Amino acid sequence: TNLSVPNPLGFFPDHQLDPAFGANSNNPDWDFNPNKDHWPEANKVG
Amino acid sequence: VQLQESGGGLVQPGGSLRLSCAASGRTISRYAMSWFRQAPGKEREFVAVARRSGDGAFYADSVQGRFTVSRDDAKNTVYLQMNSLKPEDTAVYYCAIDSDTFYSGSYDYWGQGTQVTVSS
Amino acid sequence: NFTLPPNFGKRPTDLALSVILVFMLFFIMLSLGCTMEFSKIKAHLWKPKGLAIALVAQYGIMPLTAFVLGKVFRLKNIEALAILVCGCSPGGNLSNVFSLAMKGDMNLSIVMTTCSTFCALGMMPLLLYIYSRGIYDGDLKDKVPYKGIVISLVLVLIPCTIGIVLKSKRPQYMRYVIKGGMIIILLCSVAVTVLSAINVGKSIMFAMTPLLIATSSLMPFIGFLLGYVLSALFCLNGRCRRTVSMETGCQNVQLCSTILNVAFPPEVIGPLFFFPLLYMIFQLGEGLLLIAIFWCYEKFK
Amino acid sequence: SDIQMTQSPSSLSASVGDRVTITCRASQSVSSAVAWYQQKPGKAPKLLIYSASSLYSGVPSRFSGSRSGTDFTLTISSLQPEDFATYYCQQYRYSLITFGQGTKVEIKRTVAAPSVFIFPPSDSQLKSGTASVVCLLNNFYPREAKVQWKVDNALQSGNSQESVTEQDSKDSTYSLSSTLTLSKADYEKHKVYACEVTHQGLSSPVTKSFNR
Amino acid sequence: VQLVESGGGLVQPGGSLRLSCAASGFNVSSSYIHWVRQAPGKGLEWVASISPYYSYTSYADSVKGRFTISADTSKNTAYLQMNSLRAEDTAVYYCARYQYDYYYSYYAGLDYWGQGTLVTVSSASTKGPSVFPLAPSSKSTSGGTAALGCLVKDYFPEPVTVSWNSGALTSGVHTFPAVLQSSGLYSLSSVVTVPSSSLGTQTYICNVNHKPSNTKVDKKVEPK
C-alpha cells in the first residue's frame, strides 16, 4: 500500500521522481493506506 | 439418523428421574433437541427444549421450576432430569431434534419414547 | 502541542524545492557519469569482493547500530521504530558524491548502490520483521515502496548511463558538460538550503530533543567508523575502504519518511516528521568534516 | 482492510438477577482499545467501559471489563430491569473505527405457543386491484418462527414481508404478521390459500386456510 | 457539554445534503468529532472523522469519495456533506466526541452523542394511506379469542398513528412496525383481540392519522 517513487536526495514525503508532481498538489495518490494506526504504545519507553 | 430414549419407570410422588436419549445417527452439536410429553390418548404437549451449546434452556409453563434439562456435546446425549414428580406428569415422553440452525422448530426426526407413570 | 505551518506540502515554495531536488539528482548523476567506465563496472560485478563486503557492512552495522542506540538512550517506541526504519534503508546516492570527494573507485560506488538498492527489496522487510519485535506489534511489510524502489533505480541509472556514453564516445564537450554540472549543482544547493529553511520555519524547534539530536548525530559517525574498520579487516587497498565507509555511513533517508507517513497518522509521528531532515543535515556535516580532514592529511603526506 | 469484530452471543436471554457475559473478539491485535456501548431502543448510545477494562463515570458497579489477548468480555454482576438493551463493541487502535454486530438482552419466560389467524382480502381492496393476505402470530414468547405460504400445494418466495413487535410490557411475548401481496390475475387464478407456520412449542406445523 | 445536529430531511437519490454538528461547551479546534450512522433496524456503522488541529481526515470504505467532512472552528460546528446519495444511505446520523484519558495517554469512549437527525433518501412523494379492513373469520379459533385487524397501505411518510375506538381500546392492541415495500411506500398493520362474544357486540373502527398529509379514515371492521 505504498507506491511512492523515492528520491535519494530527499527528506520529506513529497520528494518523488514523478513528472506530474502530484504529491505537492492536492489529492496526492501515493499512499493507499487509509486505515492508519493510532497505537497507544507510542509514548512508552519499553 | 435415529435415536433411542433410556430411563422410564414408576416412582413415588415427589421423586426424581433421569429420562435420557442418546443419538446413534450423527453429532448433535450445531443442532438442538427438545422433549415432548404424550398424555394418554389426548394430545402431544411441549415440556422442555435444549438449545445449542450454552445458549438457552427454555422450559414449558407447567414444568417450570421443577424440571431440568442438560446436554452432552461429546456423547450427543441430552438428559431430562425431573424433580418433585406429580400424578399430572403421567405421560409417554417423546423426543425430537431441530433440523434448523436458527431454531425454527422444524422437528424432523422423532423417537419411540418411554412410558413414564407416577405411582402413588 | 506540535503542529506544522498551515497547508504544509502544498504551498508554492515546497513545490519549488521538490522540483529543484530532481534537477540536483539529474545533474549530479550526469556529472558522476563522467568518471565511470563500463568495462571496470563489469569487472567489479564479475569479481565480487568489495561489493559483498559493502552489503555485509551496511546490513549488519546500520540496523544493529539503530537498535542499540534505541535500546541504550531509552527512547520511546515511536522514536526507536523511526530510527530502526531509517537504518535498514538502502545506501542512497549521496555516497557516490562523498566517494568522489575522497578519490574512491567510482565504478564500484555504482555497483554497491545499485545492488544494495535492489537487495533492499528483499532485505528491508526481513530486517524490519527481525528487529521490530518487541517494539511494534504490526505489519510493516506492505508499506515498503517496492515498485517505487525499482522505478527509482532505473530513473537514477539513466543519467549515469548518459554520462558514461558521453564520456566514451564524444569527449569534446566533456569539459563544458562537467563545468555546467558543477555550476548547476552549486546554484541548486544554494537554492535548496534557503528554500528548506523557509519551508521549515519555526516548526523545527519542536524536533530538537537532546535524545533525537544525539542519536541522529551518533548513527552516521558510527556507521562511517565501523564500515571503515570492517573493510580494513579484509585488507583492502585504501580506496575501496573509503568508498565502503562512505556508503555504509550514508543512507536513503526518504524511505523512512514515506514509510512513517503511510503507517502512522500525523499526530502519532509528532516531531519525527523532521527526523529525516536531521539525519540529512548531520550526515552532510560529518561528510564535509571528514572530507576536510582527509584533504588536510593528504596535504601533509 | 477493516478490522472485523465477532461479537459471539447474538440474542442472549437472561432474567432478572442472573449473570451476563458478552464476548467480543478482534480479528487483529488492537492492544487495549475496545469500548462497550449500551444503546437502548429509540435513544442515542451511551458509554459503559473504555480501554476494555475501565469504567466510565456514572455507570453502576454491575458492569465490568476484561481482556485476554484479543478476546474482550463484558460481565454484568446482576441483571436489573433496566439492563435489557443492545450492547456494542468498538475499536480505537486503527483509523477506521469498526463497531460490533450487537447483543440483545431480552427477558426470559416460559415457552408459549403462537395463535395463528388468517384474513382474506377485503372487497374494497379487491376492487382496488390488489389482494393482500395477512397471517397473524399472536402471543408467542420464543421469537423464532418460520412462515411458509402455500397455495394448491405450491410454495412462494420473494413476495411476502413480515414484521415482529418488541417484547410486551406485561406478558413479555412477541407478535408476528406475515403479508402476501399478489396481483389480480394470480389471486383469481388460484383456488385455496394456506399458511404453514413452524415453532419450537408446536409439535407439528399448524396450517390455517380459507376458500374464496 | 452537548452536541446538536441539524439538517436531516428528505433527499432524492443522487442529491446532496449538509449535516451540521453545533458543538457547545468545548472547542472543535482540538476535539475529535465523529459521525456514526445507524440504518433503520440495524447495528451502528461508522462514516467519517475529523481532527481539526492536525487536519487529519479519514472516511469509511462505503462512503469513500462521496462524503466530505469539514470543521468550522470559527462557528464551532462540524459539517458532513454527502454527494450521490444512494438509496441505501437512509439512516439516523449521530455526532460523537472523543474522550481523552490522562492517566493512560490515549483516547477513551465517545462520551457525548447528539440526538440524531433522520436522513431518508427515496424518489417517492407524499401520499395518503389506504385502509383495507381485515374482516375476522366466523370460524377462526372459535371460543374466547377472536382476531380483528385493520391494515393501512401505500403511504410514503414514515410517521403514522393508529388507535382503536379513539383510545378506548388498549387491551391486546398490537401496532406492528411499518415495513418498506419494494414499490417505495410503507405499509403498516394493526391487530386487536376480542373475547369473541358476538365480536363484543360493539362498533370497532380504526383511527389512523397522518400529519405529513391531511387524512383521517375511520373504517368499520365488520364480520364477513
Numbering used by the authors:
A (entry chain B): 3 to 48
B (entry chain K), E (entry chain H): 2 to 52, 52A, 53 to 82, 82A, 82B, 82C, 83 to 100, 100A, ...
C (entry chain A): 11 to 311
D (entry chain L): 0 to 211
Text from the published report:
Cellular entry of the hepatitis B and D viruses (HBV/HDV) requires binding of the viral surface polypeptide preS1 to the hepatobiliary transporter Na+-taurocholate co-transporting polypeptide (NTCP). This interaction can be blocked by bulevirtide (BLV, formerly Myrcludex B), a preS1 derivative and approved drug for treating HDV infection. Located in the basolateral membrane of hepatocytes, NTCP plays a vital role in transporting approximately 80% of bile salts, particularly conjugated bile salts, from the bloodstream into hepatocytes.
We obtained a 3.4 Å EM density map revealing excellent density for NTCP, bound BLV, and Fab3. The structure of NTCP was similar to that of the previously reported, substrate-bound NTCP23, featuring a translocation tunnel in an open conformation. Based on the structural observations, we divided the sequence of the BLV peptide into three sections - the myristoyl group, the plug (residues Gly2-Asp20), and the string (residues Pro21-Gly48). The myristoyl group of BLV interacts with the surface of TM4 (Phe128, Leu131, and Met133) and TM5 (Tyr156) of NTCP and is exposed to lipids from the outer leaflet of the basolateral hepatocyte membrane. Starting with Gly2, the first 19 residues of BLV adopt a globular shape that forms a plug wedged inside the translocation tunnel and reaching the middle of the membrane bilayer. The string domain of BLV (Pro21-Gly48) covers the surface of the plug and crosses the extracellular surface of NTCP. The superposition shows that the plug of the BLV peptide partly overlaps with the substrate binding pocket. However, in the BLV-bound NTCP structure, there is no density for sodium ions and the residues that have previously been shown to coordinate the binding of sodium ions, such as Glu257 and Gln261, are poorly resolved.
